[PDB]
Amino acid sequence: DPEFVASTYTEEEIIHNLLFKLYSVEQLALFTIDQLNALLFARGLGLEKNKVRAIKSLLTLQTSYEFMEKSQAALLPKVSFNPTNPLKPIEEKEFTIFGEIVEIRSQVYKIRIDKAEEEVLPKVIFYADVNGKEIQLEVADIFDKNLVSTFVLGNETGLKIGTKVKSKNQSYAIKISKRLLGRVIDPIGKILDDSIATPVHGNMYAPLEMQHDSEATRYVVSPKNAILETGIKVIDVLLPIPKGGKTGLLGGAGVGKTVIVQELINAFIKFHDGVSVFAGIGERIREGHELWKEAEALGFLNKTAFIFGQMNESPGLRFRSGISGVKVAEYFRNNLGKSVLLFMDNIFRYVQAGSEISSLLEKTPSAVGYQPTLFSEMGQLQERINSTKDGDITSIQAMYIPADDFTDPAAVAAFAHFDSTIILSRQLAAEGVYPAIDPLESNSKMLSIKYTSREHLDIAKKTVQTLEKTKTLEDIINILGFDALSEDDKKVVEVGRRLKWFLTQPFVVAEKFSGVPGKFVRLKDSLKGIKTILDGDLNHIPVSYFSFVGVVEEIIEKFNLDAKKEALKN
Amino acid sequence: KIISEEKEILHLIEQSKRDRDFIDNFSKILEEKNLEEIIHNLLFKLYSVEQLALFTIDQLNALLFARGLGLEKNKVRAIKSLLTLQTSYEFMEKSQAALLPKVSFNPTNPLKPIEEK
Amino acid sequence: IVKTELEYVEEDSRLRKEKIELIQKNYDNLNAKPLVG
Amino acid sequence: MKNLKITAIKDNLIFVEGEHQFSFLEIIKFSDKVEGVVLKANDRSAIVAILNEDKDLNLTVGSLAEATGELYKIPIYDNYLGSIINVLGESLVKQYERTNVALDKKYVFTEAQPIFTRSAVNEPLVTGITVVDGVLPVGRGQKELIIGDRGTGKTAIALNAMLAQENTDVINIFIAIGKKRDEIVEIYGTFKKHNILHKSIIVSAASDDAVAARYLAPYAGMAIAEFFQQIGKDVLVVMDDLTNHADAYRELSLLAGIAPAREAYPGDIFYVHSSLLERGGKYGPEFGGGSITILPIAQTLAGDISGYIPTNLISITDGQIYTSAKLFNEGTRPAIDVNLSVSRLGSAAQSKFMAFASSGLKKIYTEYKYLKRLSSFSSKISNRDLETLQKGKAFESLIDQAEYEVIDYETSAILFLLLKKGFLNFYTEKTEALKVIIGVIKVFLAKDVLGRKMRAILVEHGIDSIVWNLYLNHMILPLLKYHLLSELQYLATNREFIKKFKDIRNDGRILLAYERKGYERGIAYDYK
Amino acid sequence: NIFANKIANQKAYFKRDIKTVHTFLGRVNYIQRASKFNDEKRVFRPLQIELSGTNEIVDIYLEATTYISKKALDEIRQNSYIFLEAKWLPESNFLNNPLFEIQNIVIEN
Amino acid sequence: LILKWNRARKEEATLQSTLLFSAFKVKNQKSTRDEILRLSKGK
């Protein structure tokens, strides 16, 4: 019954389900390069410059059990995910507490309450109306029955002594739904992508409320057991990313974290067919605008929910961006049953905003002037990312380490939660190596036998050993000359050089800088290429051929073509 | 017809491997079980699984009736019910030896102090 | 050197058959003759 | 009934007003589920820190509270075993069911028992790690610190020590202070999988829990351990970790108005940990007769042992196991640095057989390290160079160990004696050889009818050299020789193997029939 | 009593989860050693069971994955009498004889 | 060099923390004095 099965699907749902259509190899041989490239781009496998390789990639993607499952389900009547333990919207109340500002300062305002139908609660929001603009003040300390202290969530311009304020005795709330995808907002829900401020349609949820019946419910979690596929050779081979855990992106300034973040967003939305939430904390306006524009251009904007706590906003507003992003991810998992990949940038700025709020409210600074509640706040942020029967919430968070000081209290707080650390090097980037991930310094907890095979572990261990040994021998080469090495040391050095250069990869997002098309490399292809290189099979090829390629065969083909041209030239 | 039977078997094998390796429900992990005259004989007589195997159906039914449990027409069901009843300790939960104070030897015939007066 | 998963399975089988041959060789190395009477 | 009114709610603390005889750490009940403890008080008011949180209870200025007039006491319930609880007793994950009858109620700040209630530490605690059990011994009633960098294996070492008590009748208590709930659930699963769940409890205070809960979690764990000790039980306590506890105490004190001291910690940070860790030890028969062993964990930053809290904790415990990041990067697991690790109890904490077996191994290890780092020219002194390069490498191969792998105490001692008698010279870095030897010895000493008596003799009494030589020559060596010659091909031509195992009795005919009968790979006489 | 000494040697293992199981009840005519196949993570044990009430010979395979399951599997010897409940595993489609997982078992030797 | 750096950084950090808290403890003298007065009067 095609009419009946199509009657349960919206037109947009059919448009999406056109992706999971099975193509026979007999048909696939008849396509052209242009159609094959369009199919690959639609399915997120990246461009291919060969015919048979493109057909093989499409067949490998199609022969996967998940793809076949989606294709088989796409020809059946719609089945609705029944939400167990959904997020309940806030309750409908009235403005029950009234008062006015009695003390002013920088970022902190005291409110005296005159007409109250109920006693004020911590963390509730007071709304003030100045020149037709609404300002939110979050409560921090309740001195007595009718006197509280508050800090601004946004801009404090226009507030003065005697400004009337009203409160519903509720914390701040934002409108969440599926319409949040493709829009850019701030932590409190103000529209940031157009001047007319077209509203977001959805229900009002309070991000500070966890809605747990009991504490024991927080222990009904499933420990991480799966590895997310990114398509990046170095990450897949050496630093597997947990699904349902946390990965930190560490480095100085300009190492290239944001490009990796954009690439991972694109790969998760296209290849993994999911929903992405971006939470910028202390996000620069120029970088936010640029990332929004490239999200629109590259085509992953309509499946991404952007929250931007800008760099110029008050510390109270900057602090809430992570919580709002976590709440959006929780809604997208619990209410809709979709796996979410949540991105955070930058965690250091979240810690700094917390320290600023602590210092403003007259609290005794901790060591190095940080807030006494540093570890508590970090845990509060990071403990809501987990993996439950409804789906997975994977987090990939970028951090800035000041002056490479890994013993800074913010970094020490962050490492307590990271499940895999990816450390970028400015020297390696300056050598032109991208994605400029340091393989020796970085490590992942998922590179064990509990999650990977024996072959993967052996390849990773041999690769790390070879890279460390060639790094040791390069100093000897530089000082005493390449002749001073032994016979085995020369082979080790050549294999290590080819391994190091084979790990570089062009991204589909980095086409703006170098103009080179990107590629998507499966885990099996990377493993086979590294296995070929480790054996010394490709030791007769100049090192310059190993840079910025996709698979092991491209180097061989390019070298063969160059040799043919050289033989023809003479 | 979209998914071949061979690929479905492979998917089943992989899913079973995943369910065995990583367990979400703790009730799926194997647990080791801790182990006047007429009433004593009723409440303390213990039979081996081979002994109950050598029994007849009527004898097992009678033994189930004597302990006030269900009676079944199947041999294996009767053996299973009797084994579950006798092996499961009503009071012991393998967590009570940790709650039992150690025994220090005591005088059975001790002298008594003088009566206070 | 590094090996593929199929090569790991083959190595496992090779070790098992080697152990079987070791079982036979352990009896063989005990230079024994049947007791006579 | 209610006799207090909330006046202010700031700094995450509650300011109760009322006329009452407040005492330090007196429970104040705000509902039937939520309660706090008094930190500071005067003749008309008090400052309270909450331990719980309820969604339906909305504490606010004007709310009523009841001052119960009793100190904070943790109740003991029968279903604690095989359960995760919080500092107030509620069971977050349980395997059995409660009876709503309190076996006891223990005050959390119970003062340590005096000097006359103590006894000497002379009974081994099995940690399942060969290097620890042989070179860094832990006795029942000792305080051993596990100190090291992040991601080096401190928690793995503590869990290994807590797994080796599967069949020793030693209670396990694991206190988690600011840990992730995922890791705690994983540890619960590991406990269930390794058959020690019925013997263990887990006290948990998560990283986003109330600061008072994270501060008082180790004391509640120690109160439970004291309850178990009072009925003559050996309790093994792990605290993971005390740096988070120091941070929680600093946060609680700073938010309460206490002045910062060195490194922003309060002025009495040493007393907080000393009065906590002094509650462990071995006690006399008239005062309980049990023991409490503590394994606190501390995190350093890039190897900086000279930190405030790490040096405070080193000066309290009876030694430390230091985990090195360089060894972890090099691939050594467990990455334990023998040079920087101490055990002040020494051979006093080892059994007679283990003391005899592992005598003078640390010296040989240090000599091997000294030679390895200073080989310099190719000139060789004598055969003693090969002697050191052989025995040191054999010891280093003995060091390595898989995760969650429990190696028995007698198996470790027998391995040490085999190493010292030159029965590992043939080794050329073939892990399966030591795996086979360990498995064979373990099965023989655990299941064999005569091996069980041999193990009991080794545990109880102290044998001499001649009796050990007879034991090794007449039972252990034939079994090892047969089970090695049937798995390792290269052992057929290994000159050292023939040079050492030529005169050993051949036992293939019997061990064959034992294999064909389905027996394990170590039974040599029969199952007891 | 012939069976009196067999009672002290009873060993009972069980799971609190209830699936569909195949029940075997009889003597172990022959049992081999254990093999490690899935990346040295599992344990494979071939069993020959003579059932009770029919006295017929059946051949099965047993899989162990956890420490407790391997400990329970190691208790089975020759002539051991078992009441075993076994969950069928989907890997038997490539095997001559079915592969099973121990759900509940009672072992006497 | 490690030894000297550790000693110096510890000294500087402790001095900075004490000097920062000095302002807070100065600003709350009146509350302490009033509490002392009302405790002295008492009952």
Ligand SMILES: Nc1ncnc2c1ncn2[C@@H]1O[C@H](COP(=O)(O)OP(=O)(O)OP(=O)(O)O)[C@@H](O)[C@H]1O
């Ligand atoms: N013996 C071992 N063999 C192999 N891997 C091991 C071993 N011991 C520990 N590991 C691994 O080393 C890693 C770190 O272990 P663990 O979590 O116990 O360390 P830690 O010092 O407590 O770290 P953290 O800083 O995360 O608290 C884990 O991935 C663990 O699986």
Ligand SMILES: Nc1ncnc2c1ncn2[C@@H]1O[C@H](COP(=O)(O)OP(=O)(O)O)[C@@H](O)[C@H]1O
């Ligand atoms: N894969 C890449 N290929 C080329 N250039 C890159 C890549 N990744 C980062 N970059 C460089 O990094 C610069 C931007 O730095 P950014 O990504 O903001 O690093 P961070 O966020 O860590 O400071 C760009 O000018 C770009 O040239």
Ligand SMILES: [Mg+2]
């Ligand atoms: Mg950036």
Ligand SMILES: [Mg+2]
């Ligand atoms: Mg740890």
